[PDB]
Amino acid sequence: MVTIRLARHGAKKRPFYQVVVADSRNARNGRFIERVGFFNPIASEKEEGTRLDLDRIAHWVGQGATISDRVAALIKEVNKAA
Amino acid sequence: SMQDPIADMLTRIRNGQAANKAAVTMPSSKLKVAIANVLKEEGFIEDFKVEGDTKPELELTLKYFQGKAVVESIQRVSRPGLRIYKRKDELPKVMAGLGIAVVSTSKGVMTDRAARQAGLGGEIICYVA
Amino acid sequence: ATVNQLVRKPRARKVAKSNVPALEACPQKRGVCTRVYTTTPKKPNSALRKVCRVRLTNGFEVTSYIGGEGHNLQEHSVILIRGGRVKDLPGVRYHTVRGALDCSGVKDRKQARSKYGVKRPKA
Amino acid sequence: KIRTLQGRVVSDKMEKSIVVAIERFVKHPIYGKFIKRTTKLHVHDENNECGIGDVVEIRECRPLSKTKSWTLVRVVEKAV
Amino acid sequence: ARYLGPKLKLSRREGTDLFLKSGVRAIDTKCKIEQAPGQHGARKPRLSDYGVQLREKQKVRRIYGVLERQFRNYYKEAARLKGNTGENLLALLEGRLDNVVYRMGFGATRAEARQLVSHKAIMVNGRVVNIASYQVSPNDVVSIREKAKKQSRVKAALELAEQREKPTWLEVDAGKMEGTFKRKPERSDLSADINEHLIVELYSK
Amino acid sequence: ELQEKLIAVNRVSKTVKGGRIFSFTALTVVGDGNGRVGFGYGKAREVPAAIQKAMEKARRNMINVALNNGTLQHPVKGVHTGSRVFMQPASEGTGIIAGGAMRAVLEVAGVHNVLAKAYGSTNPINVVRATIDGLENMNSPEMVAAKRGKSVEEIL
RNA sequence: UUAGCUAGUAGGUGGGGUAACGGCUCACCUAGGCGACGAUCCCUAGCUGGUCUGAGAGGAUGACCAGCCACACUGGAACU
RNA sequence: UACCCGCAGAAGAAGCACCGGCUAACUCCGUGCCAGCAGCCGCGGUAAUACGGAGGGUGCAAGCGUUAAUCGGAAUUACUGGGCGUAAAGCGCACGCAGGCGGUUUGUUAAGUCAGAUGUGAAAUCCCCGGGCUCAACCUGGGAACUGCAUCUGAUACUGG
Ligand SMILES: [Mg+2]
Ligand SMILES: [Mg+2]
Ligand SMILES: [Mg+2]
Ligand SMILES: [Mg+2]
Ligand SMILES: [Mg+2]
Ligand SMILES: [Mg+2]
Ligand SMILES: [Mg+2]
Ligand SMILES: [Mg+2]
Ligand SMILES: [Mg+2]
Ligand SMILES: [Mg+2]
Ligand SMILES: [Mg+2]
Ligand SMILES: [Mg+2]
Ligand SMILES: [Mg+2]
Ligand SMILES: [Mg+2]
Ligand SMILES: [Mg+2]
Ligand SMILES: [Mg+2]
Ligand SMILES: [Mg+2]
Ligand SMILES: [Mg+2]
Ligand SMILES: [Mg+2]
Ligand SMILES: [Mg+2]
Ligand SMILES: [Mg+2]
Ligand SMILES: [Mg+2]
Ligand SMILES: [Mg+2]
Ligand SMILES: [Mg+2]
Ligand SMILES: [Mg+2]
Ligand SMILES: [Mg+2]
């Protein structure tokens, strides 16, 4: 089914995750439909390490796409910052 | 056969200048008039004049500065064997802007500089330098 | 030269053949020495050029120059050619690598030692 | 507004089917010359109403046959 | 990955001083600066145009102590960057950290400034920097840290820097042993004997 | 103040009853660091006499070149007998990108930023003639303004 | 220094068939269809985003990464 | 684990090619058209800067050379950007179908052409401005670009109808 999930595109030992919309049978870093942001766990101070287009995310959820556990965590952290 | 009058016009100019001819005459046309209009406005010939009704003869009065010719180089670009059309971004700069490129546009025949200021390109007749 | 002529028959390029065809786009090929011998060079030179007839691995039978002074090359010897022709020899297009798999380095050579497979002479 | 094309009719011998030469006019990708290129399409016609040398206007539809996926709408320049 | 041999042999080949030694003793005393090194050093052959382009590039390399792959990458960056390519090449060489240490006089030579960098004696904006080729942005402070502040060779290098000409684009405070890279230097701020066009023509075959 | 460069020396011959008589030719070019450029071609039994005859003829027969600040004014072409030559104005400090004899003639011409290419035969005599013809017929915005009878601002 | 190729072939009617159009299949009818803008045949070959070079136009190429296709001892077939 | 602090002492850490011209860098001793070099021109026959060693020097540098392979230089398949009297190259001549091209004027069309808009041209890559790893390589944000195609709205000089 269609899902919303991370995609490991970083260097070794220094990850960086593109949060994308993908059919769940595809590979992780492979084919996707729409890139709706990113997350950096090694994000320094004075930079964004989380950016999510929540209107598109709510658009795909209105289409019935599922959300990963980490993406739903990052939506929580945005809805706690805001 | 006479496949191309515009290259005949340019060749009669080029050989007139090289022969130090005062004036050059030729069978007239609506386009040959519009080109001599451009060459008069930009300053390469003194004056043109078309006379006659059934078969009109266009006479060009050439221009000489310090003895030698004004028109250093004049060339045909688009030809019946190979047409040349350019967009407004890819219009050429002859001699870094010193020469001109006679361009036929939808709003009549103009130079490349006026074609850029008009924001529209067309068919490149000749490079005049 | 007419643009119509080029439309009908375009400008075709020149497929350049390789002067080392036995390598088959490889840098080196292992061979077996068939006959080790000498050859007199062209007329302006005069020497006894040390050159071996080699059955290669891919099946070809090519001749190959033996560089340097002195060689322990015999028949039924397993060498490694690398490509590169001797100008002053008819038909020799390849060089044996000195210091490879049967061939020894040049005795008592102290300059250009890697071009001849010679270890660093410790003082 | 629907997409349609025009062209000469090459042949009409097979029934309920004509062959149409659409002659497109493209620029050469290298030398800049404009070259006429001809495209043949098998066009379904009802009633066998077209002739050779006839100009026609066709649209694309669902595949009627193996080599036929085009249907005319009207005829211009009927005669020779 | 560094030249470790004799330095005046390089200055003799280039024909002029490269400031490869501290300048306490005069270089004409320490070496025959007018004679090329080697057995055949007295003879001056007619040096070719490729020769003068090589000697100019080897001059600038032997001044700053940069090897060829890195000097090539500086040429690629200076040609990529806008404006004069040779001037951007000199602005990057003057932006090197061991050069800024030399120009502030914390080390007597550029090599000694390099050794202070390599031996963790330099803080850039508070953080210790170990790399000689660290680019120093304008409006950057650069200081001797606390532990190597009590070195003898530091205030001896500041003595020789007081003997030397003051650069305009810096502002050093020798008591705290720190300074401030205010701006990148102009070509007019630098030396006038460097023909940077010979290097551009060399890497523009 | 006139900088002087010899481009190439060449030994020529002349066969007589006794045998071959050898001689030397010298191709030198002078210039003032500005548009005043001039070349010479001397020939003698000896090299310093040939360079001196070449510098002598090069100091006269100078030619004037309407330069810009340090570069050319428009992309110009020059031919002489084997050597079609293209040269082009370039950005500041890109150097003289030119081949052989053209580097020496543009260096004494006082140009500093060119993009050149010598097609055809690269014989230094004809290619330095082709560059002298290209720089000589390179024309300014003032000369084209007076020629067409307009202002420079009307020419842009 | 491959010029002719094609009888399910090209099209039509109807039946069957498929998730679906359709010679996809079958009977019947017509005699067509492709081709010098290169059919057919032969050799080679996975394609692209791209990569290398080159001032550019171009040339060569398709490793890694990503998209499509194909195969899974070889040749076949179907089931769920 | 990164990272940081301390200890001890210059210790434990430089090689490869080349030096006749192209091509940066020269002398000596063996050697004798032998041994050998070699990318091309070419060196070697008793004073070899060209062979082999040494001293010196030059270029690179934890690499340096050789070989294979691609583009370049090569405007040497030339669209950009070549030629054909004698250097390679005008069919022995002509008619002529297809094809290519086409005098001048007006009207009309809007196909080509030009302009604008929309959709698309996956991401990555390249480029620009930045950010992050002590710097860089690298990773990364945004943008530009993807020079294309389709549709629509217009323009009518030129070409075509
Ligand atoms: Mg955490
Ligand atoms: Mg390194
Ligand atoms: Mg730059
Ligand atoms: Mg004379
Ligand atoms: Mg030539
Ligand atoms: Mg049936
Ligand atoms: Mg049915
Ligand atoms: Mg295959
Ligand atoms: Mg090129
Ligand atoms: Mg199987
Ligand atoms: Mg030399
Ligand atoms: Mg001797
Ligand atoms: Mg040699
Ligand atoms: Mg080539
Ligand atoms: Mg080419
Ligand atoms: Mg030719
Ligand atoms: Mg003959
Ligand atoms: Mg002939
Ligand atoms: Mg004839
Ligand atoms: Mg007409
Ligand atoms: Mg019209
Ligand atoms: Mg249109
Ligand atoms: Mg448009
Ligand atoms: Mg993209
Ligand atoms: Mg940074
Ligand atoms: Mg019309």
Side-chain angles (χ1 to χ4, degrees):
Chain A
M1 72 289 303
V2 55
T3 191
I4 299 171
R5 63 186 178 182
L6 273 65
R8 174 66 176 267
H9 292 90
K12 187 175 78 173
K13 295 287 187 180
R14 299 181 72 251
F16 185 84
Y17 295 103
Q18 300 287 324
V19 285
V20 297
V21 182
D23 182 291
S24 48
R25 294 176 293 175
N26 286 316
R28 181 188 67 189
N29 296 319
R31 183 181 178 180
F32 63 77
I33 303 170
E34 182 182 2
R35 186 258 189 186
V36 295
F38 63 90
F39 169 70
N40 193 357
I42 315 297
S44 85
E45 316 302 357
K46 299 175 250 291
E47 66 182 1
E48 212 179 37
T50 297
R51 184 178 68 194
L52 274 67
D53 195 2
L54 299 177
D55 81 331
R56 301 296 297 164
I57 293 171
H59 180 266
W60 289 103
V61 172
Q63 297 296 320
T66 64
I67 301 168
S68 177
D69 48 331
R70 270 287 259 272
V71 181
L74 298 177
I75 298 170
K76 262 185 68 184
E77 292 181 356
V78 172
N79 293 175
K80 297 297 180 182
Chain B
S1 294
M2 286 300 298
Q3 301 217 321
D4 195 5
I6 301 301
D8 195 356
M9 175 175 178
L10 306 177
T11 308
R12 290 188 183 185
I13 295 168
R14 192 188 304 112
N15 299 328
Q17 294 288 67
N20 300 117
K21 302 292 285 186
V24 169
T25 184
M26 68 182 73
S28 176
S29 295
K30 184 168 88 147
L31 185 57
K32 291 181 184 177
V33 171
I35 297 170
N37 193 2
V38 177
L39 296 179
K40 185 178 76 177
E41 178 64 33
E42 277 283 28
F44 289 105
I45 60 172
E46 292 288 354
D47 186 2
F48 65 93
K49 186 178 293 296
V50 49
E51 51 277 355
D53 62 330
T54 178
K55 45 186 179 180
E57 291 183 355
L58 182 62
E59 184 180 4
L60 301 176
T61 304
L62 300 182
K63 187 175 180 179
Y64 294 103
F65 179 70
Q66 291 179 354
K68 69 180 181 180
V70 169
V71 181
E72 319 181 1
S73 68
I74 186 162
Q75 180 176 356
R76 184 68 183 275
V77 176
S78 175
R79 314 185 268 95
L82 188 148
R83 298 289 180 183
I84 294 297
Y85 301 100
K86 294 293 185 182
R87 299 181 68 187
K88 70 174 179 65
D89 300 334
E90 38 179 352
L91 289 170
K93 288 179 180 288
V94 178
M95 291 183 56
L98 298 177
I100 50 164
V102 177
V103 169
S104 178
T105 64
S106 296
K107 298 282 101 177
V109 177
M110 62 183 70
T111 50
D112 53 353
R113 181 180 58 82
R116 298 175 186 90
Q117 298 174 358
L120 50 90
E123 178 179 358
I124 299 172
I125 292 169
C126 67
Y127 288 165
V128 178
Chain C
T2 303
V3 61
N4 280 83
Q5 291 181 355
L6 297 177
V7 171
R8 188 170 63 249
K9 185 174 301 319
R11 292 287 174 86
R13 291 176 179 86
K14 297 182 283 186
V15 305
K17 63 183 288 218
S18 65
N19 318 120
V20 282
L23 262 58
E24 297 178 354
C26 295
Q28 298 90 20
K29 297 298 288 183
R30 175 169 58 88
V32 174
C33 294
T34 298
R35 187 174 67 87
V36 178
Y37 63 98
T38 62
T39 305
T40 293
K42 296 287 185 67
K43 189 175 72 68
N45 287 322
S46 311
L48 274 73
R49 306 297 186 189
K50 278 79 177 177
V51 58
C52 58
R53 172 69 68 191
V54 178
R55 176 63 54 84
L56 286 178
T57 304
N58 55 2
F60 289 168
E61 187 73 29
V62 298
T63 181
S64 181
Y65 184 77
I66 300 169
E69 295 178 353
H71 59 85
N72 55 0
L73 267 301
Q74 301 294 321
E75 287 81 5
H76 300 285
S77 182
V78 177
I79 60 172
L80 189 68
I81 69 167
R82 73 172 189 265
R85 68 160 177 127
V86 172
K87 182 177 183 293
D88 97 331
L89 290 173
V92 179
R93 293 176 183 173
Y94 305 104
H95 280 86
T96 63
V97 175
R98 301 298 307 273
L101 281 71
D102 277 327
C103 184
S104 66
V106 176
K107 181 69 181 64
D108 203 333
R109 186 184 178 93
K110 292 181 266 179
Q111 296 181 358
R113 292 178 314 248
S114 178
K115 288 183 178 179
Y116 294 94
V118 180
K119 305 292 185 320
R120 181 177 173 86
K122 293 180 181 90
Chain D
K1 187 176 176 67
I2 58 170
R3 301 182 71 254
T4 82
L5 287 81
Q6 294 182 358
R8 302 290 298 274
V9 172
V10 176
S11 178
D12 54 352
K13 294 182 178 66
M14 57 186 177
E15 64 183 1
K16 288 184 181 180
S17 292
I18 57 170
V19 175
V20 175
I22 298 168
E23 188 172 4
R24 59 181 174 88
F25 189 76
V26 76
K27 189 171 77 172
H28 196 277
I30 292 95
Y31 303 108
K33 182 66 179 293
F34 288 83
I35 286 95
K36 294 179 179 180
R37 302 295 293 166
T38 305
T39 301
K40 293 184 184 293
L41 289 175
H42 295 175
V43 176
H44 180 70
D45 190 348
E46 291 181 0
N47 305 317
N48 287 316
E49 63 187 2
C50 293
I52 308 302
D54 193 357
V55 183
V56 193
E57 186 174 0
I58 62 171
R59 70 173 176 87
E60 181 183 358
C61 61
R62 57 101 175 171
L64 267 295
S65 176
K66 187 173 181 178
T67 67
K68 186 168 73 174
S69 177
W70 288 83
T71 304
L72 59 91
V73 295
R74 58 186 292 272
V75 175
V76 294
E77 200 184 326
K78 182 258 291 181
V80 308
Chain E
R2 290 177 64 248
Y3 181 75
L4 272 161
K7 297 180 177 67
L8 298 177
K9 184 176 302 315
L10 301 180
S11 297
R12 286 176 64 189
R13 173 65 69 191
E14 300 295 328
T16 186
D17 190 1
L18 302 180
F19 299 103
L20 290 172
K21 285 183 178 292
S22 61
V24 176
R25 186 175 168 181
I27 193 167
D28 54 81
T29 63
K30 292 179 72 66
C31 63
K32 295 184 177 69
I33 202 67
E34 293 293 326
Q35 182 172 0
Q39 173 178 357
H40 300 287
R43 295 178 182 271
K44 293 182 184 292
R46 156 81 176 148
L47 187 62
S48 66
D49 287 1
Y50 177 71
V52 298
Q53 294 182 357
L54 183 62
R55 289 298 99 202
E56 183 69 26
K57 189 261 290 182
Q58 295 297 352
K59 180 173 71 176
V60 176
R61 279 181 57 198
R62 287 171 180 174
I63 291 169
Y64 296 99
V66 178
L67 293 178
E68 179 67 29
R69 290 183 184 274
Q70 191 171 6
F71 188 75
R72 180 65 177 268
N73 294 320
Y74 287 116
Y75 179 77
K76 290 181 181 116
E77 184 69 26
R80 186 188 64 82
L81 290 176
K82 299 180 178 69
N84 191 346
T85 298
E87 292 177 354
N88 291 321
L89 179 59
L90 292 176
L92 291 174
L93 291 171
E94 296 294 328
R96 290 173 61 91
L97 183 59
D98 59 353
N99 195 5
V100 173
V101 174
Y102 177 76
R103 292 291 187 184
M104 291 178 181
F106 294 157
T109 62
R110 295 176 189 267
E112 183 173 357
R114 189 180 180 92
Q115 191 185 50
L116 295 175
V117 173
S118 90
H119 285 169
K120 287 185 178 180
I122 303 298
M123 287 182 181
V124 176
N125 296 322
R127 297 180 68 191
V128 57
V129 175
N130 203 6
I131 293 99
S133 65
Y134 178 78
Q135 288 294 320
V136 179
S137 57
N139 299 116
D140 259 358
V141 299
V142 173
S143 66
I144 310 297
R145 68 181 298 169
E146 295 291 326
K147 182 174 69 163
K149 192 178 288 183
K150 303 296 188 292
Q151 288 185 355
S152 55
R153 65 182 178 179
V154 174
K155 63 184 183 294
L158 292 171
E159 290 281 28
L160 296 175
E162 295 295 327
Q163 300 296 323
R164 292 184 289 114
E165 182 182 1
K166 297 296 181 183
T168 301
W169 64 93
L170 297 179
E171 187 175 1
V172 69
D173 68 296
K176 295 179 182 179
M177 295 181 187
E178 70 179 1
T180 299
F181 185 79
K182 292 173 93 172
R183 62 180 177 87
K184 58 183 288 294
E186 271 91 3
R187 177 65 187 90
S188 67
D189 293 331
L190 298 177
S191 177
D193 290 354
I194 294 171
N195 287 317
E196 66 183 5
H197 62 88
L198 293 176
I199 303 169
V200 177
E201 295 169 357
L202 183 64
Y203 291 110
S204 296
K205 300 292 287 283
Chain F
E1 270 185 14
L2 277 75
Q3 170 178 352
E4 298 177 355
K5 292 176 70 67
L6 68 92
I7 300 167
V9 164
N10 194 1
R11 187 180 71 183
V12 300
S13 176
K14 176 180 179 290
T15 301
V16 295
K17 179 173 86 201
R20 274 86 59 86
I21 292 173
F22 294 97
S23 176
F24 292 94
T25 68
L27 180 63
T28 67
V29 62
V30 194
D32 58 353
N34 285 318
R36 221 184 61 208
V37 196
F39 75 105
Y41 182 76
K43 176 168 67 177
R45 295 289 182 92
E46 187 65 29
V47 182
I51 52 163
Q52 186 174 1
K53 292 183 182 180
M55 292 297 179
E56 279 172 30
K57 293 182 179 180
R59 289 184 184 94
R60 65 212 186 92
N61 189 27
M62 302 292 285
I63 200 65
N64 292 316
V65 178
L67 272 74
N68 201 1
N69 300 2
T71 186
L72 269 70
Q73 286 165 348
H74 57 84
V76 71
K77 292 188 288 185
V79 59
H80 196 277
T81 308
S83 300
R84 295 87 61 92
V85 167
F86 181 74
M87 65 187 82
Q88 179 175 358
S91 299
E92 182 69 29
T94 184
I96 296 170
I97 307 300
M102 190 171 338
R103 311 175 51 75
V105 62
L106 274 159
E107 280 174 359
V108 298
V111 180
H112 298 93
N113 293 314
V114 290
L115 296 176
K117 177 66 180 175
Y119 300 105
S121 176
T122 62
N123 206 331
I125 302 169
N126 287 319
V127 69
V128 76
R129 287 177 180 269
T131 61
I132 295 298
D133 184 17
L135 291 175
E136 73 177 359
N137 56 3
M138 178 174 70
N139 47 6
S140 192
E142 295 75 357
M143 285 175 324
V144 299
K147 183 173 72 174
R148 285 163 58 184
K150 289 188 176 183
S151 69
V152 57
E153 291 83 4
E154 291 179 354
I155 300 170
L156 295 171

